[PDB]
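Example S7 (structure tokens).
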């Protein structure tokens, strides 16, 4: 699943950022997930709707992130997940 990674990375930005070069792409992708209880690798993608875990993650400690303000980075990461649901 070359996406499991590309997704986490791209998704992060490509998801709710698809445009920029990578202001927080790989960042949140790793820092976000790797900082939201997703230190199990980009395998998260290996599971459908595994962006719900990163949601309650930052929520559990939205004050643990701060690469663009606080949760702004997540927003792009998570906000994207919600974007998928919105289509």
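Recovered sequence:
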């Amino acid at each position: 699943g070359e996406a499991v990674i590309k997704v986490i990375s791209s998704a992060c930005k490509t998801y709710c950022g698809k445009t920029s070069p990578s202001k927080k792409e790989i960042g949140a992708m790793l820092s976000l997930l790797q900082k939201e209880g997703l230190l199990m690798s980009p395998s998260d993608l290996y599971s459908p709707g595994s962006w719900d875990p990163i949601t309650a993650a930052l929520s559990q400690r939205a004050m643990i992130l701060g690469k663009s303000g606080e949760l702004k980075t997540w927003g792009l990461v998570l906000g994207a997940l919600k974007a998928a649901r919105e289509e």
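Notes on this example. The two ends are 22 Å apart (CA to CA).
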